[PDB]
Amino acid sequence: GKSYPTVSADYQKAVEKAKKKLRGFIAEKRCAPLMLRLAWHSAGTFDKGTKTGGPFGTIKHPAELAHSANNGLDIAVRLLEPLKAEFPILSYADFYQLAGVVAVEVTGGPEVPFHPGREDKPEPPPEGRLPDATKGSDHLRDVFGKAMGLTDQDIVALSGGHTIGAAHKERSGFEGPWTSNPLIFDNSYFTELLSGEKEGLLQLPSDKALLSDPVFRPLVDKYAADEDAFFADYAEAHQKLSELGFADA
Numbered sequence: 001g002k003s004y005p006t007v008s009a010d011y012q013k014a015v016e017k018a019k020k021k022l023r024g025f026i027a028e029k030r031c032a033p034l035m036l037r038l039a040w041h042s043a044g045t046f047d048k049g050t051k052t053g054g055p056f057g058t059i060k061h062p063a064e065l066a067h068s069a070n071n072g073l074d075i076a077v078r079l080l081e082p083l084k085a086e087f088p089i090l091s092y093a094d095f096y097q098l099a100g101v102v103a104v105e106v107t108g109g110p111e112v113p114f115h116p117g118r119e120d121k122p123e124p125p126p127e128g129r130l131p132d133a134t135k136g137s138d139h140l141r142d143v144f145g146k147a148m149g150l151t152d153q154d155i156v157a158l159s160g161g162h163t164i165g166a167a168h169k170e171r172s173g174f175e176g177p178w179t180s181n182p183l184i185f186d187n188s189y190f191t192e193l194l195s196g197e198k199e200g201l202l203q204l205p206s207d208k209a210l211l212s213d214p215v216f217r218p219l220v221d222k223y224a225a226d227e228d229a230f231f232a233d234y235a236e237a238h239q240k241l242s243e244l245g246f247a248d249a
């Protein structure tokens with residue numbers, strides 16, 4: 001149920017221009033995982049019942065960056081500011097979601113559809129809406145389902161975003177990559193999850209919760225066996241995530 005706003009031709013030209021420059025910049029800086037995290041932490045604050053939070057540019061606000069869940073994302077915001085300044089017509093809201101789509105693409109993942117038109121909103125949401133890594137399946141459904149309004153399939157697919165990147169003990173406190181190829185967007189997150197803990201590789205309690213939940217576990221198996229199926233479900237979930245509260249909820 002999305003009705004995307006009309007934006008001017010000049011706006012659409014800037015989107016296409018910005019998309020290309022974001023590819024070059026993110027590939028050069030090797031920061032795709034961090035940019036995906038910035039996009040996801042921007043959007044993941046949406047609460048469907050109140051229609052507050054969501055991907056509306058507030059994460060660049062120092063009050064939102066200071067949330068402990070966002071440790072390390074001020075680096076991301078800073079990295080992007082010079083490029084953003086070359087595209088003054090774009091909202092920060094659109095710019096950060098576009099960076100997220102590009103981060104998935106340049107690491108070899110699916111092409112997530114992107115629609116412009118998000119407005120930058122004045123007030124960041126309250127802290128505490130993003131998921132706690134030490135909790136489990138009920139928690140995940142509270143946050144992805146009851147707050148953001150996403151499905152159980154969306155939760156497992158989006159968890160696969162950890163196929164790129166790593167944790168840092170000075171940011172979350174957790175440390176290391178989930179995969180042997182953490183700048184490559186593939187289904188490796190799920191195959192590692194299934195195989196046991198391997199030395200050097202990370203699994204959060206929130207990752208392991210997927211293995212024991214009766215709805216989540218069949219999806220983990222699907223994705224581990226069929227990367228195309230993962231890509232399809234990932235692309236659907238990321239688009240929905242990136243559009244929470246936008247063009248209708």
Ligand code: HEM
Pocket residue numbers: 033034036037040072131132133134140158159160161162164165166167168169170171172173174204206
């Ligand atoms: C399912 C609930 C989730 C939890 C509990 C969670 C938790 C975490 C934690 C604790 C970190 C480590 C931060 C650090 O120390 O640097 C992290 C990193 C990361 N997260 Fe998630 N996350 C979740 C979902 C997501 C989703 C939905 C996405 C995007 C689709 C995502 C993408 C990433 C990425 C790409 C990193 C790596 C960042 C980097 O390499 O610097 N995560 N997550």
Ligand SMILES: [K+]
Pocket residue numbers: 163164179180181182183184185186188189
């Ligand atoms: K990977």
